[PDB]
Design a protein around this ligand. Structure first.
Ligand code: A1EAX
Ligand code: A1EAX
Lengths: 586, 586
């Protein structure tokens, strides 16, 4: 028995306030009935399906049903209940299930989609401003080695006009969207110890440099996302003012105008971020704090989204811990509130959250558009390709396990959510992925191909594309090497080619995703959008041949190889050692 | 490799604001390190564990760690990360996992537990008031057969003083808590078409009869839960007033004081419950509607919870669809609001929701205490024992699948949530389970044993205990046969004995639950609380012998058989055909 379905054309078609749903089946004991299990306002529905007279592909029987769209919430969840005389079987994002799937692990399509539809067309690039580029006309020097000493106090001098001036490089790289680390007034170099949410830190060029950057990116058609740090302030902020270098500080004034914006124990110690005293945690019980951060018309969240700043959204730092009373009490309401405020100021605003852990409860409640997809994308690859994980603990997973992991996670997400998940191989909070591969550094191009072809929006971490390496923070924030002698020019070109493949093909931006093969060293999946197919074959080990069973998903006119040295012929994949290949259908 | 852990003593112990956590391991290639993956305010933690010098059982190595309780939210989620030099493996509620478990499918213990701790000590009994008992001093006659005609208009005359008068029968049955179907003024016999939330329907004896019932149950130490129907009103309610048999109705007055409490289309048709025009749906966008239902001090939810009514809580009818704008928009906020209001009036109030489907998103967000556990308890048994399901579609699942199903569902719930899940074999909205067994009716006692020994609180559906049967509503609401000639007296006695076993043994009220064996016809599980063990063996088919491997969970002084004709000796279970046995440890 075989089944196929993806939450996208050719399997679904919207027509006259109905969502038509098509299931493919093949095999020797097909169910004489199939029920479309759908859902309206959380009520499970049993919708009849009927066989189509015409086979869509050789040996395949298509069943078709219909979801009425006029009622019910935008997110439409569904699965397939195959019925024989004596038994039943479910078809799900995670293949066949002998007992019913979880409601939150069904196929899901958001209709209407009120999310930021532009995100799926982007290539993102994350910039740690101090370490990217100095402007022409502007404390360590650029070539001085990064050391473990005083990580938070060492400034190399990168600034925002440096980014503006490097926009032609980013354009040629294929970048269409920037995510900046914090830029607001803060004493440190990473600047997550915020001192003024209302001003750009002059060390990066002040408010004028960020306005120029906003103008310049608009001119080039590039989106711009700011780092929003709202779980905690810095202890130098006027609200907290630990060093009494001002008046009215919550820290040393029981009568401060912001005494209730922080939580102090019966010992006097304020609650902070994971025991970092420089980062006192904000108490979202306070109705005045809520108004200042997101509630009011000129709250911090909306401020940088309205003119003149007109930012395209917010990365939410430590989104999972924000809440009341010193911890994450009422976390989901407040993150929903932040997102709601942002979409009020800008309906197409992108709001994604930093989630090192499992983001599904946040995303399944729709309190944010997306997450930094560490759990669903990054760590599976650290495991499969680099033998490591979030804690740098040894990891030994084969392709079966890696794809069970990746597919299980996204089964909790609608198609539209999957398409805008924020995927990267590393960040300012992890060791460089190049370094993590260790002796297996020749696998790095596999990961770059995978980054641009797995569902979600890819984000290059500045410098990855030219081969910078280093261990975890502090050593992952090296100055970007602008000397081509210090650049991996071959790696740069692969990044260029992948972003070109992405712009070129709708399936890599909008397409469903079906894992076709996943055994030991080899992963094969296909992206699927209308008649278009994109086949990707990853081999982390030595040369091998793999038979691909006839799949109606792969029944095309022909395949044109676009990247890598793999060869597909008569259902046999010839894959060189440590390779990734991408075929486009003809 | 083997592992054991349950979210209860002997595996966990709270001491000096720390939660101590113990893992059992056995096998030939044990991990030299184990990390306790815990969570504080949603931040994943890596806590070290250390081997205990003393083996807790032969061949078992114990690791122990510690969760700091002074910070973080009440619900403490955790799992075990076994680490070797080259690889890792997770231990979870669902056995070993090669990739990390979902955050919401870990072990979880609620500390402090702010839920209704009395629920786990209860035996519930659900009464459909018209069909239970007529009072001594009071339209069909009691012995007239139930027909398909005019189901909603046929009254047999049961009333609340009938229940009061039958309290000695319920006491002897072992019942400690009642759940009543709706009793408020409504035209129908089931009375889910509410006309007045503020008055008891005189057909059941009016307000005086319910006060007597509240007094009488208090006198007998019995709890009392009312059916709260807040997703929709009846169309005869004054607010809606479809038949203009009053003034000010939302239905026929664009200026009604409650026009905004209902949602009308640009056609004039109000939104209702699943196309039943007699049940117009309430619009929880309205700030005045929110205040009347749960927001205000004398709102409907709090009204029946304060004196003189002093009810113990609310069953929430159609809890999953309640929301704004004609559908389930903002459903979770409003159900949280209802529960919050109830616990404000009565801190130990029990609020559970009607969930035919998958309740996990509601329970994982803690918007309610519990659910009618159709998905986690009822339908697995309909499948395993009666070959059917929610849609009365054929079902063929063996013990492996049934227990994978039951254990997967509860893995999404903390220990405390599992203990108060509202388990029943049938209800006023399903065919009688006795009828569903069809030719396999001899399996009915297996299900009764299972109802009283699976985690959760059992609820007898009135008449089940004496063998009434019938198909789905209308035929599942027969008049209760008070003639002992029409009663299955042997079935009645099993119910009595099971509720006695439950009162007698802490493990059946508080205990963890570990499935030990689940192959084909046979299910074996053990409830576990401190040194106490309760072993349950269910065999749905012919006589068989089953070997039980040595389990440290089963290493006790001895076993005393308490119910059924099974025999345990030297790791061999001798199980008669179609049997259920319960052993208590010695
Ligand atoms: C605020 C934190 O969470 C956010 O979400 C950022 O993503 C992180 O970078 C993170 N750390 C910042 C703060 C500290 C702590 O002292 C430093 O250790 C880091 O270098 C620095 O970046
Ligand atoms: C309101 C509904 O949901 C609640 O939650 C109850 O649990 C159900 O019983 C259910 N049905 C009631 C209403 C109708 C519909 O016309 C009748 O069909 C039923 O007989 C009657 O009981």
């Amino acid at each position: 028995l075989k089944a196929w379905h993806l939450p996208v054309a050719p399997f679904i078609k919207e027509q006259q306030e109905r969502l038509m749903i098509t299931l493919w089946l093949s095999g020797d004991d097909l169910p004489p009935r199939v029920t479309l299990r759908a859902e309206e306002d959380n009520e499970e529905l049993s919708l009849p399906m009927h066989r189509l007279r015409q086979a869509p592909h050789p040996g395949v029987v298509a069943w078709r049903g219909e979801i009425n769209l006029v009622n019910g919430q935008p997110r439409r969840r569904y699965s397939f209940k195959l019925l024989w005389a004596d038994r039943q079987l479910w078809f799900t994002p995670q293949e066949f299930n002998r007992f019913p799937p979880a409601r939150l692990e069904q196929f899901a399509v958001d209709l209407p989609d009120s999310g930021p539809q532009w995100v799926a067309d982007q290539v993102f690039y994350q910039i740690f401003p101090d370490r990217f580029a100095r402007s022409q006309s502007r404390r360590k020097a650029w070539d001085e080695p990064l050391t473990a000493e005083a990580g938070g106090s060492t400034f190399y001098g990168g600034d925002l006009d440096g980014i503006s001036e490097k926009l032609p490089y980013l354009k040629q790289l294929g970048v269409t969207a920037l995510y900046l680390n914090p830029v607001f007034v803060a004493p440190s170099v990473h600047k997550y110890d915020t001192e003024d949410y209302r001003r750009v830190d002059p060390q990066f060029g002040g408010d004028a440099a960020l306005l120029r950057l906003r103008h310049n990116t608009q001119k080039e058609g590039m989106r711009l996302i700011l780092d929003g740090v709202f779980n905690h302030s810095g202890d130098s902020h006027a609200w907290f003012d630990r060093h009494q270098r001002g008046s009215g500080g919550a820290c040393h004034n029981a009568d401060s105008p912001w005494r209730d914006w922080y939580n102090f124990s019966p010992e006097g110690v304020a609650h902070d971020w994971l025991g970092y005293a420089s980062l006192p945690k904000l108490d979202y019980r306070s109705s005045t704090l809520i108004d200042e951060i997101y509630g009011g018309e000129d709250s911090v969240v909306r401020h940088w989204l309205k003119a003149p700043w007109s930012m395209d959204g917010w990365r939410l730092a430590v989104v999972h811990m924000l809440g009341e009373g010193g911890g994450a009490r009422n976390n989901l309401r407040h993150i929903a509130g932040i997102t709601q405020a942002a979409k009020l100021e800008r309906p197409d605003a992108f709001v994604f959250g930093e989630h090192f852990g499992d983001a599904r409860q946040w995303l399944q409640a729709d309190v944010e558009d997306s997450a930094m997809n560490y759990r669903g994308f990054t760590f599976p690859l650290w495991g499969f390709l680099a033998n490591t994980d979030i804690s740098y603990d040894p990891q030994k997973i084969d392709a079966q396990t890696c794809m069970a992991w990746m597919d299980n996670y996204r089964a909790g997400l609608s198609h539209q959510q999957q398409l805008r998940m924020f995927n990267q191989l590393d960040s300012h909070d992890t060791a460089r992925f190049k370094s993590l591969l260790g002796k297996d550094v020749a696998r790095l191009p596999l990961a770059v191909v995978w980054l641009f072809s797995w569902p979600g929006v890819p984000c290059i971490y500045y410098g990855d594309e030219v081969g910078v390496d280093g261990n975890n923070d502090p050593f992952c924030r090296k100055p970007f090497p602008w000397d081509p002698a210090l650049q991996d020019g071959d790696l740069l070109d692969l990044y260029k080619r992948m972003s070109k493949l992405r712009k070129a093909h709708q399936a890599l931006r909008y397409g469903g995703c079906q894992v076709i093969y996943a055994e030991d060293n080899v992963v094969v999946f296909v992206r699927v959008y209308k008649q278009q197919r994109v086949l990707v074959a990853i081999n982390r080990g030595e040369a091998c041949e793999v038979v691909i069973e006839d799949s109606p998903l792969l029944d095309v006119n022909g395949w044109q190889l676009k990247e890598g040295a793999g060869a597909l012929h008569d259902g046999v994949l010839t894959l060189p050692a440590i390779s990734a290949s991408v075929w486009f259908s003809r």
